[PDB]
Design goal:
261 residues; alpha/beta; Rossmann fold; nine-stranded mixed sheet; globular; carboxylic ester hydrolase activity; AB_hydrolase_fold
Length: 261
């Protein structure tokens, strides 16, 4: 597998705060099409790596989803976390901005003067995000089927029919979400997808911010996010077991998966 990076994983290595690669980061000087961004990247990765763009929810900023930057980058990805043009941007706008962030990562990859010149395989991209940013990630996936993976958290959109999504999609849900309730939001969205590899992981007792920075379930959430991205973005079947497993955990109140391998 030409995309495989790093050593064979274990549950403990995936549950730790960081993976095997050193992470460097920089703030984007001139954001193109979004408000602000921070790029996280691995050093001495052993090859080009995929890129992931992460967008927050309504009223929120990078801080809400920042943990994923070093968490994912340390396992071999270039990650861009963004602030939107406005904190009041809706899901469609968030999707457009998420794609603009991936675009800028691609721009930086091809620009001789950037720190990440030649570090990215621009044909391998992923999308993540929280709440309206989760809805945005799903819209991105629906409109851009070449994306290799999606892993939104506590997603919301005004529509729940995401049957057009063919991208491998993992949905993190928060059991006690009162903003985007699981039964009216995450679950119907999940249930609408009939054409892809998909997964649904619901966090026991979780509020709407249960997958955000500083959360108490980073061991599990981070393991699953990294495993999903590794399996689908890198086609790395060393991660199939972790990507597909139904975790035996009291931290999980519901688990669903389909077409996973």
């Amino acid at each position: 597998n030409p995309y495989a990076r790093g050593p064979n994983p274990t549950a403990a290595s995936l549950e730790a705060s960081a993976g095997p690669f050193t992470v460097r980061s920089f703030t984007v000087s001139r954001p193109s099409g979004y408000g602000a961004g921070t790029v996280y990247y691995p050093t001495n990765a052993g090859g080009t790596v995929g890129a992931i763009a992460i967008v927050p929810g309504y009223t929120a900023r990078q801080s809400s989803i920042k943990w994923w930057g070093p968490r994912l980058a340390s396992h071999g990805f270039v990650v861009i976390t963004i602030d939107t043009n406005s904190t009041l941007d809706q899901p469609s706008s968030r999707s457009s901005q998420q794609m603009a962030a991936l675009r800028q990562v691609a721009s930086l990859n091809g620009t001789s003067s950037s720190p990440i010149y030649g570090k990215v395989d621009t044909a391998r991209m992923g999308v993540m995000g929280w709440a309206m940013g989760g809805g945005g990630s799903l819209i991105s996936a629906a409109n851009n089927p070449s994306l290799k993976a999606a892993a939104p958290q506590a997603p919301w959109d005004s529509s729940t029919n995401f049957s057009s999504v063919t991208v491998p999609t993992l949905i993190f849900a928060c059991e006690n979400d009162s903003i985007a309730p699981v039964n009216s939001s995450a679950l119907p969205i999940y249930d609408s997808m009939s054409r892809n590899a998909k997964q649904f992981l619901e966090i026991n007792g979780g509020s709407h911010s249960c997958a955000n920075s500083g959360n108490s379930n980073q061991a599990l959430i981070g393991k699953k996010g990294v495993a999903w991205m590794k399996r689908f973005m890198d086609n790395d079947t060393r991660y199939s077991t972790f990507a597909c497993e139904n975790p035996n955990s009291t931290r999980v109140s519901d688990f669903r998966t389909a077409n996973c391998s």
